Design an enzyme around this catalytic site. Structure first.
Site, PDB file in Angstrom:
ATOM      1  N   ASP E 146       0.874  -1.195   0.003  1.00 34.26           N
ATOM      2  CA  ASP E 146      -0.145   0.012   0.051  1.00 34.26           C
ATOM      3  C   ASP E 146       0.957   1.184   0.021  1.00 34.26           C
ATOM      4  O   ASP E 146       1.648   1.293   0.972  1.00 34.26           O
ATOM      5  CB  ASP E 146      -1.006  -0.235   1.191  1.00 34.26           C
ATOM      6  CG  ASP E 146      -2.043   0.767   1.158  1.00 34.26           C
ATOM      7  OD1 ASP E 146      -1.714   1.927   0.925  1.00 34.26           O
ATOM      8  OD2 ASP E 146      -3.077   0.390   1.453  1.00 34.26           O
ATOM      9  N   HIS E 219     -10.603  -0.797  -7.214  1.00 32.50           N
ATOM     10  CA  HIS E 219     -10.012   0.297  -6.398  1.00 32.50           C
ATOM     11  C   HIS E 219      -8.940   1.296  -7.343  1.00 32.50           C
ATOM     12  O   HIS E 219      -8.975   2.259  -7.347  1.00 32.50           O
ATOM     13  CB  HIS E 219      -9.208  -0.089  -5.218  1.00 32.50           C
ATOM     14  CG  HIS E 219      -8.837   1.083  -4.398  1.00 32.50           C
ATOM     15  ND1 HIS E 219      -9.740   2.048  -3.937  1.00 32.50           N
ATOM     16  CD2 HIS E 219      -7.464   1.412  -4.041  1.00 32.50           C
ATOM     17  CE1 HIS E 219      -8.977   3.017  -3.268  1.00 32.50           C
ATOM     18  NE2 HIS E 219      -7.558   2.583  -3.226  1.00 32.50           N
TER      19      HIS E 219
HETATM   20  C1  HEM Z   1     -10.184   2.316   2.292  1.00 28.12           C
HETATM   21  C2  HEM Z   1      -8.773   1.908   2.748  1.00 28.12           C
HETATM   22  C3  HEM Z   1      -7.902   2.223   1.560  1.00 28.12           C
HETATM   23  C4  HEM Z   1      -7.112   0.909   1.409  1.00 28.12           C
HETATM   24  C5  HEM Z   1      -6.926  -0.183   2.039  1.00 28.12           C
HETATM   25  C6  HEM Z   1      -6.358   1.266   0.133  1.00 28.12           C
HETATM   26  C7  HEM Z   1      -5.337   0.579  -0.529  1.00 28.12           C
HETATM   27  C8  HEM Z   1      -4.824   0.782  -1.647  1.00 28.12           C
HETATM   28  C9  HEM Z   1      -3.881  -0.176  -2.535  1.00 28.12           C
HETATM   29  C10 HEM Z   1      -3.649  -1.575  -1.971  1.00 28.12           C
HETATM   30  C11 HEM Z   1      -3.530   0.597  -3.557  1.00 28.12           C
HETATM   31  C12 HEM Z   1      -2.779  -0.345  -4.559  1.00 28.12           C
HETATM   32  C13 HEM Z   1      -1.178   0.177  -4.444  1.00 28.12           C
HETATM   33  C14 HEM Z   1      -0.937   1.621  -4.332  1.00 28.12           C
HETATM   34  O1  HEM Z   1      -0.654   2.294  -5.347  1.00 28.12           O
HETATM   35  O2  HEM Z   1      -0.766   2.093  -3.237  1.00 28.12           O
HETATM   36  C15 HEM Z   1      -4.170   1.590  -3.630  1.00 28.12           C
HETATM   37  C16 HEM Z   1      -3.938   2.815  -4.620  1.00 28.12           C
HETATM   38  C17 HEM Z   1      -4.389   4.166  -4.650  1.00 28.12           C
HETATM   39  N1  HEM Z   1      -5.383   4.392  -3.503  1.00 28.12           N
HETATM   40 FE1  HEM Z   1      -6.290   3.352  -2.141  1.00 28.12          FE
HETATM   41  N2  HEM Z   1      -6.901   2.627  -0.515  1.00 28.12           N
HETATM   42  C18 HEM Z   1      -7.511   3.051   0.475  1.00 28.12           C
HETATM   43  C19 HEM Z   1      -8.416   4.163   0.341  1.00 28.12           C
HETATM   44  C20 HEM Z   1      -8.237   5.177  -0.590  1.00 28.12           C
HETATM   45  C21 HEM Z   1      -8.594   6.525  -0.628  1.00 28.12           C
HETATM   46  C22 HEM Z   1      -9.745   6.808   0.210  1.00 28.12           C
HETATM   47  C23 HEM Z   1      -8.267   7.049  -1.651  1.00 28.12           C
HETATM   48  C24 HEM Z   1      -8.292   8.536  -2.125  1.00 28.12           C
HETATM   49  C25 HEM Z   1      -9.089   9.359  -1.687  1.00 28.12           C
HETATM   50  C26 HEM Z   1      -7.196   6.289  -2.537  1.00 28.12           C
HETATM   51  C27 HEM Z   1      -6.402   6.613  -3.237  1.00 28.12           C
HETATM   52  C28 HEM Z   1      -5.364   5.844  -3.868  1.00 28.12           C
HETATM   53  C29 HEM Z   1      -4.948   6.191  -5.068  1.00 28.12           C
HETATM   54  C30 HEM Z   1      -4.616   7.303  -5.872  1.00 28.12           C
HETATM   55  C31 HEM Z   1      -4.013   5.083  -5.426  1.00 28.12           C
HETATM   56  C32 HEM Z   1      -3.212   4.857  -6.607  1.00 28.12           C
HETATM   57  C33 HEM Z   1      -3.910   4.482  -7.870  1.00 28.12           C
HETATM   58  C34 HEM Z   1      -2.781   4.306  -9.246  1.00 28.12           C
HETATM   59  O3  HEM Z   1      -2.604   5.312  -9.876  1.00 28.12           O
HETATM   60  O4  HEM Z   1      -2.540   2.900  -9.385  1.00 28.12           O
HETATM   61  N3  HEM Z   1      -7.203   4.960  -1.540  1.00 28.12           N
HETATM   62  N4  HEM Z   1      -4.814   1.886  -2.301  1.00 28.12           N
END
Ligand code: HEM
Ligand code: HEM
Ligand code: HEM
Ligand code: HEM
Lengths: 306, 306, 305, 306, 306, 305
Positions: E146, E219
């Protein structure tokens, strides 16, 4: 079962060696410090666990023993004997108490030494203080790896700790200390190959020279002594480099532990007085001893209980 | 007790496994090296105290034993037994001496291997050389945590070291080695859940599957063997990954130590030949053994004494 | 213009992969190039903060013509074979270089697995070396190796393409050579003789005095002044490798420079000699078995494919 | 032959303390879990060799023992005895099972706690959960180094492990837990000198006050208990800080292991009920106990054989 | 040149998130503390150079801004906008001040939080406190790595810092926080392959799924946003795991920095309200938001110039 | 212009060496100055990446005129002795300063050996101190020491010579003084009294509020404003040292600044006092036994000799 002091523990990156004499009338103050030294070590050491590795080994000389204690005495405890060879001499210098303090960081050693000396102020006179440091890959100031053939495990216990031969002092050991200064200008004029012939091992790789090329007057040849059982007599060495660049002081602080002083003394006699085949140890052509003392390091419970 | 070699020591991040055959006429050269190998280990290893964790375990095969030594032989020493299952085969390949070299860094292992081989050049032929590396959180090339159920402490000593059943050889052990290559393309075609059923444990968390869900032909089921008494028969595994990406070589170097080869051989029979309930171990549908050899690793004093 | 990680320091582990592109494999390769930064992050992020994973990707001259239709970097050409009287610098095939470093081999291996997984069937492997740190930054000749590398601004000036070739600013040129050493011959020399071959003291790594340093020592031959009397520098990330059973004791040479001219001048001095020196004495104990030249573009160039 | 759980192991930088009660009808689930706890510890812990240092010590309370097992009970196993001093009270609170989980990293602790609680879901009710952390150089929330006088080595084995006096339960130990909350505002209004007099050691340096400055109502004087023979009775403490800054919760999680609860109970009596010279331990003027439970931690093999 | 707070810094192994509201009449006390927070950070942090990595970012909410300051306000500073989706809701909860505290060790974070809260006692009411911890190889509680696609270097500066679009507040940023609790029981009922389809990357290896197999309600798909000019809209996320096993609380503390709230709000709208090809983000079928607050984190010099 | 490593952080080990230049020693010294960066790399490269070896070389006022013709730095003069009513800041001889730092003493010692080896017969040693880190960045008085040092852009502005003396830009000025402490007297004070001497809390290192902080406290007296309204800042790299047998518990003070006027202003305030304070209370427990002032030129100045 008696608990030894930390005489079997490995080399560390930092050490302080402190040798003092006990002033007339200082005996009681000393006895009280000896009963507290383990407490002082824990007080400082516990702060830095798990990787501080602080220890202190406390030793008592022969003359001091006779002033401090009215009871039994360790069978092999005597003053260091001066060895006056034709060329080189192993001097005997005053010292009643040894503190061999080791840790992974100098601050811990210095903090403990502070506390010990604070409790002895006015009862003792300092004779020597050396702050040792690890030099690259366990090298000494001659540039050779130093400690390789130390015994380990069970062999180390058998070589170092007093046993049933002196049961009242089981778990103790005998430490011999000598401060050596080296003539680095002379040494650095030798080729590496000539240096290897002085020591008896290869300089960069630390591999022993074969028997058919190792000179009889090399250090390793003279300090290799076969015992009655054919084994090879062993001691445990915790030597540390020290020095001061402005004074051209480049030193090895020798400390060797053994179950009886006879083993260490036999090695010293071979080095300084020589053999039929070797006048003296060639390491001494580049090394001068300027201190020499012998101490008994009692079992930990001995100190705690007096 | 006799001093064992470092057969009880933990997994490290780097290893070298070297297997060689002894050339006709090379026996004396080999005997001389055997008597020196502990010395060579200390020569290199002391340089990297306290974190280097260098060790070398030396093993001798059954045919080589008779070429090198007269008189006593360890009771369990025999050539590796080829197992020709219906589908999968555990091959026997030539190997007279094993050097199992481990450290926290590959340079120490390479330096020691260099010194060993330098002393054997012209007397031996290399058969296998593998440079193993830690893969993430103790994983193997199949992506599973590998080593979990190794015995520790007194259970390890009881499982690995020869004792009173063969007293002249007490403190020795028996090593079986097999180099395995994996079919990673077929493996990656299974779901995680299907892989878990092949192994018998959960992939990410390394928790063992419950007995109601664990297949009879899963690896953990087939290598869990009870004695007639009803105790588990254990071995100590020091398996390491290795590979070459360009050649699509993704391997597990299997090495298992045990107090008698009969335990390891029972496990191998169950895996390759099966039981009433399982035709063979499903891990072998993704793993090919390309070497197989058996060695006795004597107590350290045996080697020192020639 | 953001460079690839060509300025980053030596690490304890490395993998060097050189492949050729099979006919018909061009499109697969272009898709991988566009994704290589993504893959690096995918593996590397797992090992923050101390993994120190990086991958530098290079493209050879012949490959450039097959992959790309626009301008070429000004200095890009095939490695020039040098046939000296005695020693030869061979030129060997290589279209793509992956220079993968980390503090642990597993990260390097995991990234190389992902790259090769995408390329299977489109490329043929030519060379793969797994390098490891050897004591205190030593090479297999037992000398500290890397000492005089430029640092900070001097490194940037020496390594990165700038205004001289503006479409390619932020790139670099890498020359690779795999060397095997004759350790038996080398160990027949005294330490002092070995010092005279290299030009520095063995144990302490201090440079020999100008008046004692032989003209055919390595350091003397690879010390080059430009017409303005300023030192020509390269950045070397050499790693040891080998196999004891095969008596393979190696140096994997890789050197980065802003223009290949600098690296080539050094090679010419080494293999062909000067008026003072027939050839570099290091080559009496070292044989080159590969030789390839690559351009390592700015990171944005690969991302925008 | 009796293998202790890891009650002798050192402090670590992270800990989780979990206390649960067993629900009516949850007994079979708990027994099944107890038999697998060592297996779960290896499943998680092997991932983080060599530096993870994961352990789990599992304790069983008096009432729970009778519900789970039929047969002998440990001689010293009774419910925690409430102590109602004139001012300060040592409360008794419910707890059937203790899991004392330690590692160098909280993730390992949390992962093991997750697996344990996953297996127990439905069968137990959580009573307390504390996540402890190392605070600077082994300090507690009062700012003092905490743990210094813990026994080590043979002295620790003698103080902590059940032996010949209850031979069926040899290798077990007794654990007392108490969660303390501190009144940091009141504490921080004392001078350092006054704080030192409450504790009985120097604050910065951790050196013990000499007997003559050391108040008789200092914590160290009151928890120093000499047995019939003039020998100190010792316990092994693995206390950890914990807290929540927003709720002003600054706590010490007290956990003390001993071979008999009587030692720990005597110390608690001196603290809460005082002596001729001291009404009660001054530490309690700044510390409130909000939990109090007593557990027997069996030998490892006892749990395995279920 | 405005100096930003440490909003571009990397993830650390420990974090404390503290959210408070300002009591009526507490404004002057808060202003004094804001002017001193850098000082306090230095005071604690310097003790652990060079590896402590202590930092504190302070944020101020919309309503608080207007109580504390007069004059111009940041262009995008508003209260968090509640999103009421057909199925899932992003709640808005009270919070006037955010302290985002990071270090390599929890003790440093706690010491700083103690100092801050000590200065604010009686002026603020705590709303939320979370102690975050690194989970294996930068994993979250769903078991995925993450943070991978966070921007770095100049791309991060451009994504995170206010520039010429609001020049009086250049060098500030906007932080959105949401505390999420996960339904681990439901999540663990999915196959690994199904979980991968929810996230959009491979679980064990962290490689992104191909465009062809990546679902539209995954996601990664939904949080991948392009602006009208074709540029990718990015945020910097410093999420940390947290939890309590007894209460079955397995959490992600979400914190995301961006140069305007519009980017983060656009991602939230897509997640909660969906798009043409997705009703909502599947991750929300396993994750509930229990807090939601928006803060402006001013340039460092703004705070110091109070 | 590349500075020496004058902006680099505190390390766990240091050697401070002060020497004077003997009759006819100038040529030998000049040759060593031109080589000191080379020697630093020779030793330091062996301990990548953790060794953190650096050497800062300073030259005193009298020695400058012996070694170099042409411009002098504007602020270079002999250290000015301050004879206060009670306490004195002594001046002692010193022509060259070597301030050597690393994460391990062996690296410092090796580098000092090579420097002194080159200077044998040309210099007379004046002082040699081996400093060590003491717990959590404490000094021998038990206080955290270095907290308020500037960082980043503020440090560059405070420490490096700029357009005010452009021929010497990138240089700095170092003042050294060896202090010995009366620990018996200090330990006679309560912790609360010690806090009032220093001006910060002992355990937690938090600054005393303005309400409570004494005017003759150390922190008060060394907080100096310039007319700009600006805080005058210096960068201190002081280290503990000592010998238990000699009852020698020391602070080796070394402070870098863009002009000596800042450091001299703080010294005046400490030793001579102000309208509100006779002298700095820290001096009631601290005795200066050396004092010297050096200019540390930009690195390229030394290289160019
Ligand atoms: C609910 C809990 C959340 C979890 C467990 C979670 C988990 C993750 C995971 C596993 C990834 C893929 C690896 C990474 O690039 O970090 C990811 C990507 C991302 N998350 Fe989340 N996330 C959460 C909430 C959010 C929220 C609330 C936002 C935005 C308001 C967000 C925005 C992003 C963004 C921008 C990416 C990168 C997408 C890309 O360009 O590849 N996430 N997140
Ligand atoms: C057999 C392969 C090689 C080995 C073992 C080797 C080893 C060394 C050593 C030990 C040094 C001295 C320490 C240092 O500054 O790094 C050195 C310096 C150097 N080597 Fe080599 N080298 C090899 C090949 C090459 C090649 C092929 C080139 C250039 C095309 C090269 C260019 C340099 C340069 C530029 C220096 C620094 C010289 C200076 O300015 O002092 N080396 N090498
Ligand atoms: C508020 C809870 C507690 C705090 C903050 C605390 C703190 C300390 C400290 C700072 C020391 C001195 C250093 C050391 O040797 O560890 C100490 C010693 C000790 N504590 Fe406590 N303690 C607490 C509760 C208890 C309890 C409940 C017991 C026993 C039932 C206990 C037994 C001891 C013992 C046996 C020693 C060692 C005394 C000696 O022999 O010198 N403590 N404690
Ligand atoms: C006598 C031995 C000295 C000791 C033990 C000592 C100790 C300290 C301590 C503990 C601090 C507070 C923490 C910090 O900010 O570093 C401090 C601050 C300071 N010291 Fe000293 N110091 C000594 C000599 C000097 C000298 C000789 C100077 C200047 C010529 C000086 C200049 C400073 C300055 C500028 C500060 C920061 C004050 C502020 O802005 O808050 N110190 N020193």
């Amino acid at each position: 079962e008696p608990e030894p002091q930390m005489v079997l523990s490995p080399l560390t990156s930092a050490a302080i060696f402190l040798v003092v004499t006990i002033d007339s009338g200082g005996e009681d103050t000393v006895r009280d410090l000896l009963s507290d030294v383990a407490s002082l070590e824990r007080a400082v050491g516990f702060r830095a666990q798990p990787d501080g590795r602080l220890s202190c080994v406390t030793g008592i000389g022969s003359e001091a023993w006779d002033r401090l204690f009215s009871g039994a005495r360790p069978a092999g405890l005597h003053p260091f004997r001066e060895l006056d060879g034709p060329v080189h001499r192993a001097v005997a210098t005053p010292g009643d108490l040894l503190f061999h303090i080791r840790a992974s960081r100098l601050d811990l050693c210095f903090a403990l030494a502070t506390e010990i000396m604070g409790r002895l102020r006015g009862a003792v006179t300092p004779q020597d203080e050396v702050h040792g440091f690890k030099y690259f890959d366990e090298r000494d100031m001659l540039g050779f790896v130093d400690g390789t053939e130390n015994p380990t495990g069970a062999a180390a216990r058998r070589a170092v700790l007093v046993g049933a031969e002196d049961p009242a002092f089981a778990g103790g050991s005998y430490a011999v200390v000598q401060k050596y200064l080296h003539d680095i200008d002379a040494w650095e004029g030798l080729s590496v190959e000539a240096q290897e012939r002085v020591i008896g091992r290869r300089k960069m790789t630390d591999v022993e020279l074969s028997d058919d090329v190792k000179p009889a007057d090399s250090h390793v040849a003279l300090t290799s002594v076969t015992g009655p059982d054919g084994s090879d007599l062993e001691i445990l060495r915790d030597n540390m480099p020290f020095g001061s660049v402005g004074r051209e002081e480049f030193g090895t602080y020798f400390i060797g532990y053994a179950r009886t002083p006879e083993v260490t003394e036999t090695m010293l006699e071979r080095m300084f007085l020589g053999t039929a085949s070797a006048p003296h140890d060639r390491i001494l052509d580049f090394s001068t001893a300027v201190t020499g003392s012998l101490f008994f390091t009692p079992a930990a419970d001995f100190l705690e209980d007096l």
